[PDB]
Amino acid sequence: QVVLSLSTAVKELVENSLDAGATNIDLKLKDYGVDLIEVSDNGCGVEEENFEGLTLEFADLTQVETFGEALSSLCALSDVTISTCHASAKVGTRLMFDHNGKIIQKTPYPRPRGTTVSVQQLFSTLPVRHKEFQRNIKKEYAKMVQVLHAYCIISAGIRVSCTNQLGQGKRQPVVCTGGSPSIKENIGSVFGQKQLQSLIPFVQLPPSDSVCEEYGLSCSDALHNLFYISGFISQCTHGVGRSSTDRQFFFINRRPCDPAKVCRLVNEVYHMYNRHQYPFVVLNISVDSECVDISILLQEEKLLLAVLKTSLIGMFD
Amino acid sequence: LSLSTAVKELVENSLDAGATNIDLKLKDYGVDLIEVSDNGCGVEEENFEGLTEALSSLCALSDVTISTCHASAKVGTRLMFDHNGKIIQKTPYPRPRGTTVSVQQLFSTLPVRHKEFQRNIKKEYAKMVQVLHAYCIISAGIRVSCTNQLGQGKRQPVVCTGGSPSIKENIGSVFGQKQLQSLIPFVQLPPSDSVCEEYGLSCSDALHNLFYISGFISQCTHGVGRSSTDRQFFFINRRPCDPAKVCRLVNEVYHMYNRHQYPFVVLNISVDSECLQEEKLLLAVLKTSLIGMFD
Numbered sequence: 001q002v003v004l005s006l007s008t009a010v011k012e013l014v015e016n017s018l019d020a021g022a023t024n025i026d027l028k029l030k031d032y033g034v035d036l037i038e039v040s041d042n043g044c045g046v047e048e049e050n051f052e053g054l055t056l057e058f059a060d061l062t063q064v065e066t067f068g069e070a071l072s073s074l075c076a077l078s079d080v081t082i083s084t085c086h087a088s089a090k091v092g093t094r095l096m097f098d099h100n101g102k103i104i105q106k107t108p109y110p111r112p113r114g115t116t117v118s119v120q121q122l123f124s125t126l127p128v129r130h131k132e133f134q135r136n137i138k139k140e141y142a143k144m145v146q147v148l149h150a151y152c153i154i155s156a157g158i159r160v161s162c163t164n165q166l167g168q169g170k171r172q173p174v175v176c177t178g179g180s181p182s183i184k185e186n187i188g189s190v191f192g193q194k195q196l197q198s199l200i201p202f203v204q205l206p207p208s209d210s211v212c213e214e215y216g217l218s219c220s221d222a223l224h225n226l227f228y229i230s231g232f233i234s235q236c237t238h239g240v241g242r243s244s245t246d247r248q249f250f251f252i253n254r255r256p257c258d259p260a261k262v263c264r265l266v267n268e269v270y271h272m273y274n275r276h277q278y279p280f281v282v283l284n285i286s287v288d289s290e291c292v293d294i295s296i297l298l299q300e301e302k303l304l305l306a307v308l309k310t311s312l313i314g315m316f317d
Numbered sequence: 318l319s320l321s322t323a324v325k326e327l328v329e330n331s332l333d334a335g336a337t338n339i340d341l342k343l344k345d346y347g348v349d350l351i352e353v354s355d356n357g358c359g360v361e362e363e364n365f366e367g368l369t370e371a372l373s374s375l376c377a378l379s380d381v382t383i384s385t386c387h388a389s390a391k392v393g394t395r396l397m398f399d400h401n402g403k404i405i406q407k408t409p410y411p412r413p414r415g416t417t418v419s420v421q422q423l424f425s426t427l428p429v430r431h432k433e434f435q436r437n438i439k440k441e442y443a444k445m446v447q448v449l450h451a452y453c454i455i456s457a458g459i460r461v462s463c464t465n466q467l468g469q470g471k472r473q474p475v476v477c478t479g480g481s482p483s484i485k486e487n488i489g490s491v492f493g494q495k496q497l498q499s500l501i502p503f504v505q506l507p508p509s510d511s512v513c514e515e516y517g518l519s520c521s522d523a524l525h526n527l528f529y530i531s532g533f534i535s536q537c538t539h540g541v542g543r544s545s546t547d548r549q550f551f552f553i554n555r556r557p558c559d560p561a562k563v564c565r566l567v568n569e570v571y572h573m574y575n576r577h578q579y580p581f582v583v584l585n586i587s588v589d590s591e592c593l594q595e596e597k598l599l600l601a602v603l604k605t606s607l608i609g610m611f612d
């Protein structure tokens with residue numbers, strides 16, 4: 001599904017940095033992104049033979065919503081500058097592109113290995129969408145921080161930072177991870193040590209007979225269990241939970257997504273022990289890529305739901 | 318000795334290792350953790366014992382953990398050191414090439430110095446930011462970043478450069494594009510006859526001029542300057558320092574046109590290593606160029 005939003009725009013630039021094998025990703029914003037969206041990484045960079053080509057199998061979960069290929073769509077909607085340097089390249093380069101993806105000017109640019117993609121005046125070519133962007137900047141910015149917090153939690157060993165600047169004012173911190181190898185440590189960088197106190201780690205269990213009978217699972221149905229689930233969830237004790245689903249993140253094969261059925265189940269089991277609060281949820285479902293399809297479709301999903309409810313109940317008891 | 322002198326040596330080690338990415342991690346402004354991560358050359362295993370000079374002083378004053386990976390090494394290594402510099406434990410550690418030096422509980426071995434650190438954490442952190450902003454501005458083509466986390470709060474970005482090859486962009490990354498508006502680039506001129514006579518310099522004295530000066534300074538127009546010397550950085554061969562005579566002179570010329578404000582100063586002095594020799598020639602060149610710029 002094609003989408004043109006602030007959340008889908010930053011997501012593609014981050015995906016490009018992750019695919020490049022980057023360990024440092026810096027996101028710079030101005031006017032919540034209305035004026036500038038800049039993503040800098042120390043990844044592989046782009047070779048000179050692929051400079052013109054910048055703008056011209058198992059299911060990918062991130063491709064549920066594309067933007068506008070992203071880089072060609074971005075040039076048609078704003079002004080894009082790209083400075084990059086490949087390891088095989090002696091000197092880096094700085095590129096300016098027009099609205100059709102043509103390289104306006106290319107100059108040698110001495111810079112460390114990696115790529116920096118700058119997106120200035122997003123949606124400037126569409127005055128109707130640009131005004132709707134400015135008017136609903138609070139909602140577009142809220143959706144972007146949620147996707148940004150999701151990549152920070154799951155990207156262990158990668159330093160992800162973000163700042164925002166309004167007018168001539170000072171840069172404002174948004175989110176920052178320390179390059180920690182564990183997901184638990186990343187949660188402490190995004191939300192603080194206070195958030196980690198009311199959390200318990202997910203402990204997977206085989207589906208119980210009571211839960212298996214609720215979903216209609218035979219002993220044969222559950223024998224080929226290939227779901228490996230891990231993460232953290234809020235304690236079921238009254239008071240330690242949250243008031244909404246504002247901090248609930250889900251991942252399939254380390255890709256942020258939203259399985260509506262899984263989400264309704266995890267919240268329902270929490271309501272069985274804390275009807276007045278919502279849990280903090282960070283949960284990754286590890287499964288073979290072939291068993292995942294996009295219409296989110298998961299083979300033996302009834303077996304996955306039985307494991308989650310059984311494990312959540314055993315933890316909350 | 319101090320928090321400012323501790324980060325300075327760790328940055329020098331990363332710079333000397335040929336690093337292009339330098340990350341500084343702090344906790345409680347550095348009272349709890351001082352961590353510097355780079356993508357430099359790393360250390361080979363045969364030189365692990367020789368690591369412990371700044372690094373020897375750091376182990377004697379805190380607990381130091383070092384994770385590194387050499388280009389010739391398949392997998393990195395993680396080292397824990399005691400207060401004598403001895404490797405407590407050495408374990409293989411999968412990490413990208415480079416080095417990460419962690420300094421935890423600085424001055425813990427000296428209860429007197431540790432307490433003075435916490436009591437004066439506001440002043441010591443300001444001195445470290447002055448040393449940190451200097452390396453961000455001068456390290457062209459090097460990504461220098463810093464983060465800090467206080468207590469149970471979240472980690473927050475402090476400063477970050479983009480690896481730009483120019484000093485002007487590094488100034489814009491540290492202080493913002495607004496700072497770049499009231500600045501003019503230094504334009505070097507030969508020392509004036511009037512300025513040469515003030516210092517007692519013959520015409521022969523100025524023929525062997527080896528001073529190459531560059532950088533940026535605030536405009537002398539009233540109002541665009543700053544209220545203090547908070548943003549004045551000086552460099553000799555791209556090394557941050559404070560030449561008192563040079564610093565006093567630059568502020569004196571600025572006051573000649575703006576008596577009520579102090580300039581923003583970023584100045585690098587390039588000179589032959591043996592030479593400060595012939596400082597009267599350097600001051601004559603410095604005073605002459607600033608006047609020609611401010612006229």
Ligand SMILES: Nc1ncnc2c1ncn2[C@@H]1O[C@H](COP(=O)(O)OP(=O)(O)OP(=O)(O)O)[C@@H](O)[C@H]1O
Nearest residue numbers: 016017020041043044045046054069070071072115
């Ligand atoms: N930060 C980056 N670092 C290195 N290469 C990049 C970077 N960003 C883009 N590229 C290169 O530009 C090309 C086009 O990127 P684009 O996002 O438009 O499509 P794609 O990444 O190839 O596929 P898709 O976005 O649909 O998953 C990429 O193939 C990549 O080689």
Ligand SMILES: Nc1ncnc2c1ncn2[C@@H]1O[C@H](COP(=O)(O)OP(=O)(O)OP(=O)(O)O)[C@@H](O)[C@H]1O
Nearest residue numbers: 326330331334355357359360368370371372373416
């Ligand atoms: N980030 C680093 N990356 C690679 N090698 C390092 C790093 N830090 C230290 N080393 C190596 O360990 C040795 C000890 O460092 P130390 O700072 O104590 O002394 P030095 O760097 O040789 O000179 P000085 O202490 O006078 O500045 C260094 O010589 C260097 O070879």
Ligand SMILES: [Mg+2]
Nearest residue numbers: 012015016070
């Ligand atoms: Mg892409």
Ligand SMILES: [Mg+2]
Nearest residue numbers: 326329330371
């Ligand atoms: Mg040294």
